[PDB]
Amino acid sequence: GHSMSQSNRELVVDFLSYKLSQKGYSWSQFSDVEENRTEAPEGTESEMETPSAINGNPSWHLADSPAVNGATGHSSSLDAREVIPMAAVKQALREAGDEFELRYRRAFSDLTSQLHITPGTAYQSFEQVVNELFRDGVNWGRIVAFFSFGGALCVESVDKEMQVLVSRIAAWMATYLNDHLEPWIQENGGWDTFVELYGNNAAAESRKGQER
C-alpha cells in the first residue's frame, strides 16, 4: 500500500528532477535511467580515437564557423513563468518551492551535521532527516520545503560522492516520504486536488477541525 497513482511521488520527484536537470541535464532526460555507467571510463586505447589523421583531413578549405560571439544560449532566453492549468504540477509546486529554495540559494543550516549524507545505503541517515522534519507532521509549508532540502542535498552529495547518489536519496526519500505522507497528503483533499490545486479542500481538511 504505497501511494496511489504516483501522485505524491511525482510532487517530490518533480522538484528533484527539476533542480537535477539544472545541475546535470541528464537525469531529467528519462527521469529513470537506472544506470550511471553508460559513459566510457578509462583511456588506455587512444589508437582508435585519433580522427583527422587517417582519412578525415585537417579540413582547411572553409572550416571556420564556430558561431561564438559571446553569450550563446547562456542567459538571453531565460523562461520560468509558464503556469499551465489542468495540472499545475511543474508550476504550482515548482514556483511555491522555488520561492523558498532559491530564496537562500542553498539554505545552509545545521541539518547537515545531523544528516551526515553518506554513499552507503543511508537507510538510518535518510530516515533520521525525515524523523526530525516530521516532529510537527507535514503541512503545505512543511511539504513544499521538504522538496527543497531533498533537491539541494542530492546536488551536494552527488558533487561530493557521485551522481549515483541522487538515485539513492530520491529512492529513500520518496519511499519514506510517501510512507507517512500517503495519508497526510490524501487528507489534503485528494492527490489530484492537491496537485491540480483546483480544490485543495475536499472535506478531510475542511469539515474535520473540531466539529467543523
UniProtKB/Swiss-Prot annotation:
Motif range (BH1): 132-151
SUPFAM superfamilies in UniProt: Bcl-2 inhibitors of programmed cell death
One MF annotation (Gene Ontology) recorded for this entry: BH3 domain binding
Source domain of life: Eukaryota
Region (Disordered): 31-74
Chain positions of motif BH3: 89-103
Name of the gene this protein is made from: BCL2L1
Gene Ontology BP annotations: apoptotic mitochondrial changes; apoptotic process in bone marrow cell; cellular response to alkaloid; cellular response to amino acid stimulus; cellular response to gamma radiation; defense response to virus; dendritic cell apoptotic process; dendritic cell proliferation
Name of this chain's protein: Bcl-2-like protein 1
InterPro entries: Apop_reg_BclX (IPR013279), Bcl-2-like_sf (IPR036834), Bcl-2_BH1-3 (IPR046371), Bcl-2_fam (IPR026298), Bcl2-like (IPR002475), Bcl2/BclX (IPR004725), Bcl2_BH1_motif_CS (IPR020717), Bcl2_BH2_motif_CS (IPR020726)
Pfam families linked to this entry: Bcl-2 (PF00452), BH4 (PF02180)
Native species: Homo sapiens (Human)
UniProt-annotated site: Cleavage, residues: D64, S65
Keywords: Apoptosis, Cytoplasm, Cytoplasmic vesicle, Cytoskeleton, Endocytosis, Membrane, Mitochondrion, Mitochondrion inner membrane, Mitochondrion outer membrane, Nucleus, Phosphoprotein, Synapse, Transmembrane, Transmembrane helix, Ubl conjugation
Residues with Phosphoserine modification: S52, S65
UniProt family annotation: Belongs to the Bcl-2 family.
Domain notes: The BH4 motif is required for anti-apoptotic activity. The BH1 and BH2 motifs are required for both heterodimerization with other Bcl-2 family members and for repression of cell death. The loop between motifs BH4 and BH3 is required for the interaction with NLRP1.
